[PDB]
Amino acid sequence: TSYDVVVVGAGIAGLYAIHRFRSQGLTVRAFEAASGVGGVWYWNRYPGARCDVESIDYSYSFSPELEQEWNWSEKYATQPEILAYLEHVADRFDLRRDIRFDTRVTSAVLDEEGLRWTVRTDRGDEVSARFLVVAAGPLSNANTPAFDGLDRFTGDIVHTARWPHDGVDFTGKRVGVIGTGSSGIQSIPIIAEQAEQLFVFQRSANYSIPAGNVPLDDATRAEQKANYAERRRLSRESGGGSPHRPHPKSALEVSEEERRAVYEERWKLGGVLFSKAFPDQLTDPAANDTARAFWEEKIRAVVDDPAVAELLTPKDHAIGAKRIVTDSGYYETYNRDNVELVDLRSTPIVGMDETGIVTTGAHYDLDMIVLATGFDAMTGSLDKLEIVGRGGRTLKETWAAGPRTYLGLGIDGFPNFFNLTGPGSPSVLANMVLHSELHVDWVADAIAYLDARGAAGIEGTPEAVADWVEECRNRAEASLLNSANSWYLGRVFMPFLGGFGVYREIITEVAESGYKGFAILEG
């Protein structure tokens, strides 16, 4: 019941963690709440669930064999394909034997003298670890909003977070969807394909850009696969972990014709990359406005009814402030005869009854209600974890006035503890597979550094975290991501905004210099 490393989570990050640590001779125990590997790709399985970043980028690079061997069927893989990929990865590297599934980590307590972590679970596991590595992911489900009389409704209630494995038939059914974030946006067009009638209950419109999905052919695949190494080098040095860069010139320093041409290009590629089309797009409000206009025109042209197009248009929000969603035929869905967009600002939901949804304005008879829930704060999974460090001081207490980290990898009072791809790191702002590889590699090197020195532990110094907190604050203040009610907030803007390449370089040089800003512990 003791191991070198305990890993929390078996999604992209935990799976690579198991592989990397084991390869270096460390014994590893992983714990996963879900019944299988995959993380978000295991449990978030509503129809239309799909990644934001091209699959060739949003995939592992640690294995040349896997890169050559695996064939992505399209530009943006759906979750069943990403799940299949991750299951294949766990097969190839024999990861499952070190994972205990259906097992939720509840507490981790530092033994200050021994420099070890006692990790406890809801299934009665109690294990001892030199290093505790939390790979619990950036996205956890929001609580189902309290609707009165929900318990009274007699039709089916389906949650996008807990989608039935064997699916749900919408044929013949009157369906209501509450929620227009990414879960609602991705499932809506698919729901509308087989539903008798679909009502979308929208409170706040969000920005969405087409995926523009193409099935990747043979001659395309082999040519991208032939140039994979170079694509990875460009990705690892870039702002967002993909082989793309913003325009050389600024948005306002270019002509109106050329501005449309750059925007038109990035619309085709589609996704998150549209947000970073010009260098100052997320920096300067006026440059942002030009992207908002381009977006509004595109949507006005796709949606037949002018008033619906207006209703689908987000009001006084910077485009790309909140993360832009990626869709497959979402706005085209509203041209159908069998879909209605309900403005909840006009007529809010006041409850449900036996037969459907009650708004202030009208009652809606429904056979099925789909709760397209959103995702909790970036720290949501960590907040379900009781982590007791030096002095019996909890992580939740340390983070009360905001997350405090050095590089996202060190916290004073929490030695030999590593939170992956969370606050103080680029996190959701970068390609997370590559980001996971970066963090897992960094942790492994740090462990190797300590083992070579005969040292017991490593810990963020108070001075270094304070410098980093302010460094994060400084990069954040110029950004339109630091919006009044931004999800990246907790006040403290949580992710590192400098860029992924910049951050890689910062943490690599820290390591190379004998871990400045960390204390090496003999313990």
Ligand X SMILES: NC(=O)c1ccc[n+]([C@@H]2O[C@H](COP(=O)([O-])OP(=O)(O)OC[C@H]3O[C@@H](n4cnc5c(N)ncnc54)[C@H](OP(=O)(O)O)[C@@H]3O)[C@@H](O)[C@H]2O)c1
- Give binding residues as ranges: 13, 32, 40, 51-53, 58, 105, 180, 182, 203-204, 206, 375, 432, 487
The site that binds ligand X (CB under 6 A) totals a number of residues, namely: 19
Q: Return the number of the residue (311 or 456) whose C-beta is nearest ligand X.
A: 311
Instruction: State the nearest-atom distance from the C-beta of 317 to ligand X, in Å.
Output: 10
Which window, 129-137, 177-185, 435-443, 445-453, contacts ligand X (CB under 6 A)? 177-185
- Residue from 155, 181, 410, 498 touching ligand X (CB under 6 A): that is 181
- Residue 178 touches which of ligand X, ligand FAD, none (Cβ within 5-8 Å per kind): ligand X
Instruction: State the nearest-atom distance from the C-beta of 441 to ligand FAD, in Å.
Output: 15
Instruction: State the nearest-atom distance from the C-beta of 307 to ligand FAD, in Å.
Output: 29
Q: Which of residues 391-430 bind ligand X (CB under 6 A)?
A: 428
Instruction: State the nearest-atom distance from the C-beta of 344 to ligand X, in Å.
Output: 6
Structure tokens, 134 = 């939390």
CA 55 to chain centre: 15
Under the binding rule (CB under 6 A), the answer on residue 487 touching ligand X is yes
- Residue 181 touches which of ligand FAD, ligand X, none (Cβ within 5-8 Å per kind): ligand X
- Residue from 7, 9, 42, 52 touching ligand X (CB under 6 A): that is 52
Cβ contacts of residue 164 below 8 Å, gap of 6+?
158
Structure tokens, 55 = 């699959």
- Residue 246 touches which of ligand X, ligand FAD, none (Cβ within 5-8 Å per kind): none
Question: DSSP state, 76?
Answer: S
CA 424 to chain centre: 15
- C-alpha pair distances (Å), 97 with each of 17, 27, 33: 14, 12, 15
Q: At what angle do helices 218-226 and 228-237 cross, to 10 degrees?
A: 60
Strand partners, 208: 325
Structure tokens, 48 = 């239309």
Say if CB 239 and CB 217 are below 8 A apart: no
Residue 310's CB is within 10 A of a number of other CB atoms, namely 14
Question: How far is Cα 59 from Cα 72, in angstroms, rounded to an integer?
Answer: 10
Question: How far is Cα 501 from Cα 240, in angstroms, rounded to an integer?
Answer: 8
Binding residue ranges for NADP(+): 52, 180, 182, 203-204, 206, 375, 487
- Residue 11 touches which of ligand X, ligand FAD, none (Cβ within 5-8 Å per kind): ligand FAD
Q: Which residue is nearest to ligand X (CB)?
A: 181
Q: In this structure, what are the phi and psi dihedrals at residue 181, rounded to the nearest 5 degrees?
A: -80, -160
Under the binding rule (CB under 6 A), the answer on residue 503 touching ligand X is no
- Residue 206 touches which of ligand X, ligand FAD, none (Cβ within 5-8 Å per kind): ligand X
End-to-end C-alpha distance for the chain, whole angstroms: 21
Binding residues vs ligand FAD (CB under 6 A):
8-14, 31-34, 39-40, 44, 49, 51-53, 58, 104-105, 135-139, 182, 381, 384-385, 421, 431-432, 436
Instruction: State the nearest-atom distance from the C-beta of 196 to ligand X, in Å.
Output: 23
Closest of 125, 184, 138 to residue 333, by C-alpha: 184
**Amino acid identity at 378:** M
Where do we find the tokens 């759906």?
78
Under the binding rule (CB under 6 A), the answer on residue 182 touching ligand X is yes
Binding residue ranges for FAD: 13, 32, 40, 51-53, 58, 105, 432
Question: How far is Cα 112 from Cα 86, in angstroms, rounded to an integer?
Answer: 37
- Residue from 131, 375, 414, 515 touching ligand X (CB under 6 A): that is 375
- Residue 129 touches which of ligand FAD, ligand X, none (Cβ within 5-8 Å per kind): none
Under the binding rule (CB under 6 A), the answer on residue 322 touching ligand X is yes
- Residue from 203, 233, 363, 453 touching ligand X (CB under 6 A): that is 203
Instruction: State the nearest-atom distance from the C-beta of 245 to ligand X, in Å.
Output: 20
- C-alpha pair distances (Å), 499 with each of 170, 241, 424, 505: 43, 9, 12, 10
Q: At what angle do helices 79-92 and 12-23 cross, to 10 degrees?
A: 10
Q: Reduce the secondary structure of 358-414 to three states and give it as a string.
A: EECCCEEECCEEEECCCECCCCCCHHHCEEECHHHCEHHHHCCCCCCCECCCECCCC
- Residue 263 touches which of ligand X, ligand FAD, none (Cβ within 5-8 Å per kind): none
Mask of contacts with ligand X, 345-374, x by CB under 6 A?
Answer: ----x------------------------x
Residues in the site for ligand X, rule: CB under 6 A? 52, 139, 145, 178-182, 203-204, 206, 322-323, 344, 349, 374-375, 428, 487
